[PDB]
Ligand binder design. Structure first.
Ligand SMILES: N=C(N)NCCN1CCN(C(=O)N2C[C@H](CO)C[C@H](C(=O)Nc3ccc(Cl)c(F)c3)C2)CC1
Ligand SMILES: *[C@@H]1O[C@H](CO)[C@@H](O)[C@H](O)[C@H]1NC(C)=O
Ligand SMILES: *[C@@H]1O[C@H](CO)[C@@H](O)[C@H](O)[C@H]1NC(C)=O
Ligand SMILES: *[C@@H]1O[C@H](CO)[C@@H](O)[C@H](O)[C@H]1NC(C)=O
Ligand SMILES: *[C@@H]1O[C@H](CO)[C@@H](O)[C@H](O)[C@H]1NC(C)=O
Ligand SMILES: *[C@@H]1O[C@H](CO)[C@@H](O)[C@H](O)[C@H]1NC(C)=O
Ligand SMILES: *[C@@H]1O[C@H](CO)[C@@H](O)[C@H](O)[C@H]1NC(C)=O
Ligand SMILES: *[C@@H]1O[C@H](CO)[C@@H](O)[C@H](O)[C@H]1NC(C)=O
Ligand SMILES: *[C@@H]1O[C@H](CO)[C@@H](O)[C@H](O)[C@H]1NC(C)=O
Ligand SMILES: *[C@@H]1O[C@H](CO)[C@@H](O)[C@H](O)[C@H]1NC(C)=O
Length: 340
């Protein structure tokens, strides 16, 4: 027997000894070793209600990544309003690793094994576990990177699809590779390569699905309508450098004669609007050599235009900024219960 409850979680990872990569270093002192023998217990004929938009695990993971980034990605200058601090900012080794979130004695994690689970409402195939799976804490905007994939169809996730102020998480069932490079020897100019055939096939399927939720209306994609570079661009961190990539070529409804390699223009930025809290961090110029990251696009962050009930269209724009939706997109099938 159990009841919905919150408690302090603990983390587990496969961190290595002597490795200087910051995620490894942080997991070495902040987490325990991964469960050598994990085994979930199935709860026969048990239906449970989940709410990925109201999940204290998300808040706790957010706390951890903030602590991780604050211990590892030390900006040269942090203009956090008023006075400014110019601490140490050596170049570091940055590559996220999987982190497990685990419950203490007296608690368990309920796991939604419904393959069409959209993140809210009842779950028919419930299992109990001691730790979540390994979740990579990938910080990004617009595109969710290096995550898990929907096991069946593309899933639409939203706290309330009818309210246009609620972010939509698109969970893909097929990943799309995005290959980003800053060639060696403008040191800040880069480019991301995406296969256009693939991207346009998935993007078409996303419109088909969104049609299902918006009574077969005309689905239109448009670039963000204003804001800072972090959300009008696809932002992410590659080898400790902050990439800002123009996704206009991705969120055009054009696709013809357009089906080759899509080349997104990118910049490595030194001055960043932080995602942890309102403030500005400045880092040193980028490192030498070929900077390259090959990542899987496993989801999209979408915001729907308002003032369209009286039209025949629904316009969708890439979103982002609140990193909790990134953790949400992986924590959606977990919930913490107390053993009564
Ligand atoms: N948890 C709650 N409830 N609020 C937190 C909000 N608090 C306050 C201030 N916050 C902003 O103001 N933000 C707006 C800002 C643009 O002005 C950009 C920020 C960004 O996402 N930065 C970013 C940097 C690097 C990478 Cl790689 C990346 F993927 C993203 C988001 C966030 C946290
Ligand atoms: C229910 O979940 C279990 C894992 O706990 C899985 O093996 C099984 O295929 C699931 N059943 C359905 C119908 O999805
Ligand atoms: C998710 O599924 C539940 C089923 O109970 C439904 O009530 C809810 O509207 C769905 N949400 C979305 C965004 O499809
Ligand atoms: C990228 O996707 C492929 C297939 O979708 C998968 O096998 C691979 O593990 C993924 N890579 C990462 C780093 O998640
Ligand atoms: C992904 O989901 C779409 C529907 O959203 C479906 O048409 C397609 O066949 C699915 N792909 C795979 C590989 O399951
Ligand atoms: C969803 O948002 C719409 C639009 O504001 C609102 O009218 C409706 O009450 C919301 N639904 C719920 C269940 O809160
Ligand atoms: C990524 O792009 C670079 C430059 O275009 C290329 O040299 C490299 O082979 C690519 N790698 C993959 C896995 O696509
Ligand atoms: C792009 O994707 C399509 C379909 O997924 C594939 O057939 C094609 O070979 C890819 N293009 C390149 C240059 O790899
Ligand atoms: C992205 O590129 C398009 C076309 O070159 C341009 O109109 C747009 O201003 C760019 N995005 C930003 C945020 O500057
Ligand atoms: C995604 O995973 C690949 C393989 O592990 C890695 O090379 C890449 O840097 C990751 N991307 C991000 C944005 O962390």
């Amino acid at each position: 027997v159990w009841k919905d409850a919150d408690t302090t979680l603990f983390c587990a990872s496969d961190a290595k000894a002597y490795e200087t990569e910051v995620h490894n270093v942080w997991a070495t002192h902040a987490c325990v070793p991964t469960d050598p023998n994990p085994q979930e217990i199935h709860l026969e004929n048990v239906t449970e209600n989940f709410n990925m938009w109201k999940n204290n695990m998300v808040e706790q993971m957010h706390e951890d990544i903030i602590s991780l980034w604050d211990q590892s990605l030390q900006p040269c200058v942090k203009l956090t309003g008023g006075s400014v601090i110019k601490q140490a900012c050596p170049k570091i080794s940055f590559d996220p690793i999987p982190i497990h979130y685990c419950t203490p004695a007296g608690y368990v994690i309920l796991k939604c094994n419904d393959k069409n689970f959209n993140g809210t409402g009842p779950c028919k195939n419930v299992s109990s576990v001691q730790c979540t799976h390994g979740i990579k804490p990938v910080v990004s905007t617009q595109l969710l990177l290096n995550g898990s994939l929907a096991e069946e169809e593309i899933i639409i996730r939203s706290e309330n699809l009818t309210n246009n102020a609620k972010t939509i998480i698109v969970h893909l069932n097929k990943s799309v590779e995005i290959n980003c490079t800053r060639p060696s020897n403008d040191i800040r100019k880069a480019y991301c390569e995406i296969n256009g055939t693939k991207w346009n096939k998935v993007l078409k399927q996303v419109t088909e699905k969104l049609k299902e939720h918006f009574n077969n209306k005309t689905i239109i994609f448009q670039p963000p309508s204003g804001g800072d570079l972090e959300i009008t661009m696809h932002s992410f961190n590659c080898r400790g450098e902050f990439f800002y990539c123009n996704t206009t070529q991705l969120f055009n409804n054009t696709c013809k004669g357009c089906n080759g390699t899509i080349t997104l223009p990118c910049k490595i930025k030194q001055i960043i609007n932080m995602w942890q809290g309102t403030g500005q961090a400045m880092y040193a110029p980028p490192i030498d050599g070929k900077i390259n990251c090959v990542s899987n696009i496993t989801g999209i962050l979408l915001t729907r235009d308002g003032g369209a009930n009286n039209t025949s269209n629904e316009t969708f724009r890439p979103g982002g900024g609140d990193m909790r939706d990134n953790w949400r997109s992986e924590l959606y099938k977990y919930k913490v219960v107390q053993i009564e």
